[PDB]
């Protein structure tokens, strides 16, 4: 019921019944893949790409039409970033928080938030390590965090 | 509610530890462990102790019932500690006399007071090798002085 806050909501995407294609909504799988690749090249993250596909074009999910997801496709092509997207975002957030703290020494809530973010990042990092995406003996923290980010 | 204690199939050591920890709230258990009887408790965690009658002392009783309870200040032989032993039945204190050896027993309450006699923990049983009850009865006689 949420990781960090005490807010237990279900703001959530439903997903339709048919694993098979929504008949009429046409195009091609290959075309979709190409589009995704292009997006990746441009700079759009997998989620972003998916959103784009949903909004203007007739795509519902890549999982449906291609068979494969988006991240997987990117990997196959050679386009998934070194740091996975969510993790990267988290890191960025942490960095921002750190910066804010530096700017304004006296700020307790902010500090707490930063700490929380860091913890989250650590968790994520650990998970990644367990999986085998990010190589082991590697902490994504604070001083080098900035460097990692940019 | 899962109710406090871990119900996992591999949560056994933790449970044991918890139990152990709890054990130190139970008083008897604690006593058994630390050797409070062996380190204190005038007697050496024993049933009885022979002791020398230092003097006859009438002690004033607690409350409700009001009386003087004909106790004896006894010095235990083995340790050297000084205690106060109540002396049972009518008279009895006369029989006990003064400077006699006196075999004490616990009063009943695993230490502690015995009803109304405040600061008193022991029955005199034998005086100089007889038995107080017996003396009272006059079934057996005293071995002179």
């Amino acid at each position: 019921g949420r990781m960090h806050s005490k807010g237990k909501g279900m703001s959530s995407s439903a997903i339709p019944y048919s694993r098979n294609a929504p008949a009429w909504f046409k195009g091609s799988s290959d075309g979709v893949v190409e589009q995704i690749i292009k997006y990746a090249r441009k700079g759009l993250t997998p989620s972003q790409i998916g959103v784009l596909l949903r909004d203007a074009h007739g795509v519902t999910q890549a999982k449906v039409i291609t068979g494969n997801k988006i991240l997987r496709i990117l990997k196959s092509n050679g386009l998934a970033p070194e740091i996975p997207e969510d993790l990267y975002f988290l890191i960025k957030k942490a960095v921002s928080v750190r910066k804010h703290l530096e700017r304004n020494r006296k700020d307790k809530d902010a500090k707490f938030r930063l700490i929380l973010i860091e913890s989250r990042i650590h968790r994520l990092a650990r998970y990644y390590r367990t999986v085998s995406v990010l190589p082991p003996n590697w902490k994504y923290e604070s001083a080098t965090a900035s460097a990692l980010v940019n | 509610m899962g109710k406090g204690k871990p119900r996992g199939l591999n949560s056994a050591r933790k449970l044991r530890v918890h139990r152990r920890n709890n054990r130190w709230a139970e008083t008897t258990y604690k006593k058994r462990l630390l050797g409070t009887a062996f380190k204190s408790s005038p007697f050496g965690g024993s049933s009885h102790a022979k002791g020398i009658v230092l003097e006859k002392i009438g002690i004033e009783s607690k409350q409700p019932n009001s009386a003087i309870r004909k106790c004896v200040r006894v010095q235990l032989i083995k340790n050297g500690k000084k205690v106060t032993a109540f002396v049972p039945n009518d008279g009895c204190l006369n029989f006990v006399d003064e400077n006699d050896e006196v075999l004490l027993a616990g009063f009943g309450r695993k230490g502690k007071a015995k009803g109304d006699i405040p600061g008193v923990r022991f029955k005199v049983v034998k005086v100089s090798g007889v038995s107080l009850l017996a003396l009272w009865k006059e079934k057996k006689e005293k071995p002179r002085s």
């Binding site: 019944y17 048919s18 694993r19 | 119900r7 996992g8 199939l9």
Partner: protein
Amino acid sequence: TRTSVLADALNAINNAEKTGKRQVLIRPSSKVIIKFLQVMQKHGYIGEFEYIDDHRSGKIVVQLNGRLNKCGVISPRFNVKIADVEKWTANLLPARQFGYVILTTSAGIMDHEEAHRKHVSGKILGFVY
């Protein structure tokens, strides 16, 4: 987290029974759960039950007969060494005569009597009396 899905289901069923409902809706719907349900049916504690295919995990509906009294689930799946089975039964079930102690084992998810017959016990799941 949603720990012991089966347990949750059982609890729900119990609640329904207490209420006086004629049927229950169950979310997660496992293999184990299904097995349990089947066992119950065999015994004679439950009507129809139907697995909805949410194109996903599962979702069961159970027809209650009004016969169930408790449909319990013991917590960690304790390792039962055949002789201990009797003890377990004594602990859980009312009467030597009737009721069951649904326990998974090598052979399959079965009641206690069945296990005895087989000559094969294992880890407990639940009970029905």
